[PDB]
């Protein structure tokens, strides 16, 4: 009975990170080793916990938030961080406990003329409280004036997509992103390791 | 608040012009640019605008085939660029946003860059 | 859209008060026209937007209102510029009117 981290991380399709998938994890054998030792990713960094003693320590739930951004936005995803993905889009709290894990999908992603399948959020009325999911395509108004439903000046559609390319240097190629949050609640504890 | 132009230009006819206005003392990018053009003497024509953040473009049809609009956040810089360049254009090139702080974002375009005039001539 | 700005020019002497005029080809929203202000030389200055509200620094020597006007309650000789009317409608086809010279 391992748990389905297979289903997460060889995903044929990831969710855009203005809307991404969060997938519960629950009464299963985390075997972390597996993605710890893998040498498959190129960012692999644990807050709150030790990354080779994931296995020993149990949790009542583990949510995996699976989701794309371009390189140069992957610190971003991280504790007490700010800017367009941290604000907007998807945002860790200070006291964050779990794994932040990413890896280059340059050459499953992009696309020859370009990739604009994934979007991010760019106008928000407010920052984003932690873990909140914000998937409304509501016209943002930047001013004092209604839009109606109609784009135009301070009328602005939210969203905007990124430009994955095979010609892009890496800090605009895209990434897939695993964010593992570890939760312990009043609970039987549930996912360990083996 | 205020948004700093580039300077004058001379051109040849057919050749590309480069224009830049740089933004300072306020949220450059959750504002738009636009452009507009003036001859000496005459109205003020409206050229294209852009969304900062977006990087959305549209353009006036009379230059619309010709005209790119963009930007770079790194130096909170708008650029426009109009290409094969004909002698009727010189004009002087304006640029204008909204001042924007935080969420909010005035209503018109209150910040007007200085002006420069681009010449195209042999 | 064409907006059609008149008078070409508008000659009054400082004291009194006047009215510029830009009508739309079509009904336009309120909230997307604007007024400008060019002293000759300069770059115009945003007086009226949203048909009827002041720009910041704007004093109550002015106000504002298819027929949309500029409001000139009293005309002081630093408010002897050309004036224009911006369309925002929309994401593109903003246009400008021709511009009324007040001397």
């Known amino acids: 009975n391992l748990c389905p981290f297979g289903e997460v991380f060889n995903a044929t399709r990831f969710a855009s990170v203005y809307a991404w998938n969060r997938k519960r994890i629950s009464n299963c054998v985390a075997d972390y080793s597996v993605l710890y030792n893998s040498a498959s990713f190129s960012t692999f960094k644990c807050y709150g916990v030790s990354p080779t003693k994931l296995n020993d320590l149990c949790f009542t739930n583990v949510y995996a938030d699976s989701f794309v951004i371009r390189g140069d936005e992957v610190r971003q995803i991280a504790p007490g961080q700010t800017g367009k993905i941290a604000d907007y889009n998807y945002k860790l709290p200070d006291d964050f406990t779990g794994c932040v894990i990413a890896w280059n999908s340059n050459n499953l992603d992009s696309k020859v003329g370009g990739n604009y399948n994934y979007l991010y959020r760019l106008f928000r009325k407010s920052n984003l409280k932690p873990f909140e999911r914000d998937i409304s395509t509501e016209i943002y108004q930047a001013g004092s004036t209604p839009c109606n439903g109609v784009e135009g000046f301070n009328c602005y559609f939210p969203l905007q997509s990124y430009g994955f390319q095979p010609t892009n240097g890496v800090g605009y190629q895209p990434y897939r992103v695993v964010v593992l949050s570890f939760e312990l609640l009043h609970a039987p504890a549930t996912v360990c390791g083996p | 608040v205020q948004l700093v132009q580039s300077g004058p230009e001379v051109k040849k006819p057919g050749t590309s012009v480069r224009v830049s206005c740089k933004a300072s003392?306020?949220?450059?990018?959750?504002?738009?640019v636009q452009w507009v053009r003036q001859a000496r003497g005459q109205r003020l024509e409206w050229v294209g605008w852009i969304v900062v953040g977006s990087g959305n473009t549209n353009y006036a049809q009379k230059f619309h085939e010709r005209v790119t609009i963009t930007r770079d956040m790194s130096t909170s810089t708008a650029y426009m660029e109009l290409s094969s360049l004909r002698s009727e254009d010189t004009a002087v090139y304006y640029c204008?946003?909204?001042?924007?702080?935080?969420?909010?974002?005035?209503?018109?375009?209150?910040?007007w860059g200085q002006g420069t005039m681009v010449t195209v001539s042999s | 859209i064409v907006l059609t700005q008149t008078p070409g020019t508008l000659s009054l002497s400082p004291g009194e008060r006047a009215t510029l005029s830009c009508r739309a080809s079509?009904?336009?929203?309120?909230?997307?026209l604007a007024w400008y202000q060019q002293k000759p030389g300069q770059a115009p200055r945003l007086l009226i937007y949203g048909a009827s509200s002041r720009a910041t620094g704007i004093p109550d020597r002015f106000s504002g209102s298819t027929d949309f006007t500029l409001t000139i309650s009293r005309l002081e000789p630093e408010d002897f510029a050309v004036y224009y009317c911006?369309?925002?409608?929309?994401?593109?086809?903003?246009?400008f009117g021709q511009g009324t010279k007040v001397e």
């Open positions: 003392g306020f949220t450059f990018t959750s504002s738009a």
């Open positions: 204008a946003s909204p001042y924007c702080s935080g969420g909010s974002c005035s209503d018109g375009f209150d910040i």
């Open positions: 911006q369309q925002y409608v929309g994401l593109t086809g903003w246009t």
């Open positions: 079509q009904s336009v929203s309120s909230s997307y």
